Amino acid sequence: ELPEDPKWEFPRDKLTLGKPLGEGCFGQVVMAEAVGIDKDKPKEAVTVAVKMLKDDATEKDLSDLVSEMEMMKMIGKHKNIINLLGACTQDGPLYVIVEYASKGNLREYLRARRPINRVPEEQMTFKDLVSCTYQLARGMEYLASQKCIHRDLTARNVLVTENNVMKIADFGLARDIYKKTTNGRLPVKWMAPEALFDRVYTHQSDVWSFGVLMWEIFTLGGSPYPGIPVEELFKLLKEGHRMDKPANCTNELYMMMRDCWHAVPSQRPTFKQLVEDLDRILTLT
Amino acid sequence: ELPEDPKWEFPRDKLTLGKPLGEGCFGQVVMAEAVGIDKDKPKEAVTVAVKMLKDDATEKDLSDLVSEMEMMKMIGKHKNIINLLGACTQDGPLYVIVEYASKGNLREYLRARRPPGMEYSYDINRVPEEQMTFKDLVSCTYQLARGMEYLASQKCIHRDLTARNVLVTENNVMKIADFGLARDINNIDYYKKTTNGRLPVKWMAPEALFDRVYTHQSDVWSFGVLMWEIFTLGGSPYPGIPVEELFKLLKEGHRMDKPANCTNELYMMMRDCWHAVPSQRPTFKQLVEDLDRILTLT
Numbered sequence: 367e368l369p370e371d372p373k374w375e376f377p378r379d380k381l382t383l384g385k386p387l388g389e390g391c392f393g394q395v396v397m398a399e400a401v402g403i404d405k406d407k408p409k410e411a412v413t414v415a416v417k418m419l420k421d422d423a424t425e426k427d428l429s430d431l432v433s434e435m436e437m438m439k440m441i442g443k444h445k446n447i448i449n450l451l452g453a454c455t456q457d458g459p460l461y462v463i464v465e466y467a468s469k470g471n472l473r474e475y476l477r478a479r480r481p482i483n484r485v486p487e488e489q490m491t492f493k494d495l496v497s498c499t500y501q502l503a504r505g506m507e508y509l510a511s512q513k514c515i516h517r518d519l520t521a522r523n524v525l526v527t528e529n530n531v532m533k534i535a536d537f538g539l540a541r542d543i544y545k546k547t548t549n550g551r552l553p554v555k556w557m558a559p560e561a562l563f564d565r566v567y568t569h570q571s572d573v574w575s576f577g578v579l580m581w582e583i584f585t586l587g588g589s590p591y592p593g594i595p596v597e598e599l600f601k602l603l604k605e606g607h608r609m610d611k612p613a614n615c616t617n618e619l620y621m622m623m624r625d626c627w628h629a630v631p632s633q634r635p636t637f638k639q640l641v642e643d644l645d646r647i648l649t650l651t
Numbered sequence: 652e653l654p655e656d657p658k659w660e661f662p663r664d665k666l667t668l669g670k671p672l673g674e675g676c677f678g679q680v681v682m683a684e685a686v687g688i689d690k691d692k693p694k695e696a697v698t699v700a701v702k703m704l705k706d707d708a709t710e711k712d713l714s715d716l717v718s719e720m721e722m723m724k725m726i727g728k729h730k731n732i733i734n735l736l737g738a739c740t741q742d743g744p745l746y747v748i749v750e751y752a753s754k755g756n757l758r759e760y761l762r763a764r765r766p767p768g769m770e771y772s773y774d775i776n777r778v779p780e781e782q783m784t785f786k787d788l789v790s791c792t793y794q795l796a797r798g799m800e801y802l803a804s805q806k807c808i809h810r811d812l813t814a815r816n817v818l819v820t821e822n823n824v825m826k827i828a829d830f831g832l833a834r835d836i837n838n839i840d841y842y843k844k845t846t847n848g849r850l851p852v853k854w855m856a857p858e859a860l861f862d863r864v865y866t867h868q869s870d871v872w873s874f875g876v877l878m879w880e881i882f883t884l885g886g887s888p889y890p891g892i893p894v895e896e897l898f899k900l901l902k903e904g905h906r907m908d909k910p911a912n913c914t915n916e917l918y919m920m921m922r923d924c925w926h927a928v929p930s931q932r933p934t935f936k937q938l939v940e941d942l943d944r945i946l947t948l949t
C-alpha cells in the first residue's frame with residue numbers, strides 16, 4: 367500500500383520493540399534494539415528510536431509521518447539533527463527508525479541540571495550553555511543550507527544524546543522552499559510576526575524562533591513571555607515589547623536574542639551569522 | 652478582539668481558578684469555583700470547568716476555542732452533553748465555562764473499575780467498590796444514545812464520538828464532550844469532507860473514510876465502536892490491527908468480535924451499527940428504543 371524504497375527499508379524480524387519514550391499526541395516513539403542497522407557491522411545490535419502511529423491516529427497523521435520520513439531522506443546527515451537510520455514500510459505498520467537520544471529533550475535536560483527531585487551529578491556551566499546554543503545553530507545552519515525551514519523550533523523538540531550532543535528533531539511542519547495555510551499549526555510564543563500576521567515563513571522566521579530557544583536555554587528551561595497569555599501577546603509584539611534578559615546570561619548573548627527578535631526579518635542575523643558569533647563567544651569562554 | 656455577548660458573558664472577579672484537570676494536546680482545562688453563574692441563585696458558588704489556551708498554544712487553537720464555544724450555544728441544553736455555563740471574553744484571556752465532570756473521561760473511569768489483575772487496573776487509581784455491573788454498562792450506553800439522539804435532532808454531527816471524549820459527573824451521568832470537529836448539517840443534507848480529515852480512523856465509518864461524506868448514520872457507526880469500548884471496560888478497537896492494515900480489512904468486511912462481557916443481543920446491535928449501507932444501520936431514535944428495552948429487563 368505504501369511504495370517500496372529498498373535503500374532505506376529495514377527487515378521487521380531484526381527490529382525488537384521496547385519501552386515507549388513518549389507520546390506526542392499525534393505520534394508514538396518507542397525504544398528498540400536493531401540488529402545490523404549499521405551496515406558496516408551487521409552482527410552487532412544498537413539502540414534506536416522508532417516513530418509509529420497511535421491507536422487513536424487520524425487519516426492526516428499517516429501522511430504526516432510519511433511526509434516527515436521523506437523530508438528526512440532529502441535533508442541528509444548532520445551531527446546536530448536526528449538522522450534517519452531506516453524504515454519498515456512494507457507488509458505491516460509503518461516504523462520510522464531514527465537515532466536514539468538517551469538524555470531526552472533539552473527542556474527537561476536543562477531543568478534537571480538547574481543548580482521536586484530528579485537532579486543529577488552534572489550541572490550546566492556557562493560554557494556548556496553557549497555550547498548548546500552553538501551546536502543548535504550549526505544544526506539550523508545546515509537545515510537552512512538545504513533550503514529547508516523547520517517552523518517548530520522549541521527546546522521540547524531538541525533531543526540530547528548520551529554524549530550530550532544537541533539534536534534538532536520533529537520535522538513534522540518542516541517544508542522545502544513559504545505561503546502559510548492561513549491557519550498554520552505553529553506555536554505562537556516561538557512564532558515570528560510575519561508567520562503570525564502575514565502568512566509567510568522564511569529562514570529568518572526560524573532565526574526568531576532560535577531567539578526564543580536561546581532564552582529558553584539561558585533560563586535553563588524557562589517558558590517564554592512568562593505570565594503573558596497568547597491573546598495579550600499579539601498586541602505587545604506590535605508595540606515592540608520583548609522578553610527581558612535571563613539572569614544567567616551576558617549582555618552580549620541577550621543582544622544576540624534581541625537581534626533575532628527584530629520585526630523586519632532582513633535586520634535579523636542569518637544562521638551563518640549566528641554560527642560565526644557563537645563560535646567566537648565559545649572560544650573566549 | 653472578541654465581540655460582546657451579554658447573554659453568556661460572566662464577570663472575571665467572581666471566577667476563581669483551581670487545579671488543572673488535564674493537559675490535552677491542544678487544550679487546557681482547569682477546575683474553578685464560580686459565584687452566581689446560575690442567575691436563579693446568585694449567592695451560591697458552583698464548581699465548574701474552564702477551558703482556555705495553553706502557554707504553548709497555536710494560532711489555530713484560538714479560533715477552535717471560539718468556534719467550539721459558538722457550537723455549544725446553538726446546540727442547547729441536554730443532560731447527556733457537556734453544557735456551556737458562561738464565558739469571559741472581554742478585557743483578558745478567553746475563559747469558556749462548562750459543566751464539571753468529577754469522575755473524568757469514560758475510558759479511564761471504566762479502566763479504573765475493572766476487576767483486579769486486568770491490563771489497566773492500578774491500585775492507586777482503582778475503585779473496585781464501584782466495579783462495573785452489566786446493568787451499569789447498558790445504562791452508560793443508553794445515556795450516551797440519548798445524548799447523541801439529541802445532537803442528531805439538532806441536525807448536528809459529532810464526528811469524534813470516542814470514550815475519551817465522554818465525561819462522567821459526580822452522579823455518574825454520561826456527558827458527551829469535545830464539539831471541536833462537530834458540524835451543522837441543517838441545510839446541507841450531509842457534510843463534504845476535506846482531503847486528509849482529522850478524525851480517528853478506528854471510529855470512522857467507511858463513507859467518512861473513503862467517500863468523504865458524513866451523516867448522522869456515520870455517528871451511529873462511531874457509536875457502534877463506543878459500545879465495544881464500553882463492554883471491554885475501556886478496550887481499544889481492532890486490537891493488534893494497525894491503522895495502515897485496517898483500510899483493506901474494512902473493505903473486505905472485517906468487523907470486531909464480540910466482547911466477552913457482552914450479550915449476543917448487544918453484539919448484534921453493534922453489528923447493526925457497523926452495516927456497510929448507512930440507511931440499514933439503526934437511527935439514534937432506534938438505539939434509544941432498543942437500549943431502554945434492554946435496560947428495563949436487567
Ligand SMILES: CCOC(=O)Cn1cnc(S(=O)(=O)n2ccc3ncc(CCc4cc(OC)cc(OC)c4)nc32)c1
Nearest residue numbers: 387388390415417448462464467470471522535536537
Ligand atoms: C514527533 C514527536 O517526537 C519528536 O520528534 C519530539 N519529541 C519531543 N520529546 C520527545 S521524547 O521525550 O518522547 N524522546 C525521549 C527520548 C527520545 N529519543 C529519541 C526520540 C526521537 C523522536 C523522533 C522521532 C522521529 O520519527 C520520525 C523523528 C525525529 O526527528 C525528526 C525524532 N525522542 C525521544 C520527542
Ligand SMILES: CCOC(=O)Cn1cnc(S(=O)(=O)n2ccc3ncc(CCc4cc(OC)cc(OC)c4)nc32)c1
Nearest residue numbers: 672673675676677678700702733751752755828829830
Ligand atoms: C483539547 C485538549 O484538552 C483535553 O484533554 C480535553 N478534555 C476532555 N476531557 C478532559 S479531562 O479528562 O481533563 N476532564 C476531567 C474532568 C473534567 N471535567 C470537565 C471537563 C470539561 C472539558 C470540556 C471543556 C469544554 O470547553 C470548551 C467543552 C467540553 O465539552 C464540549 C468539555 N473536562 C474534564 C479534557
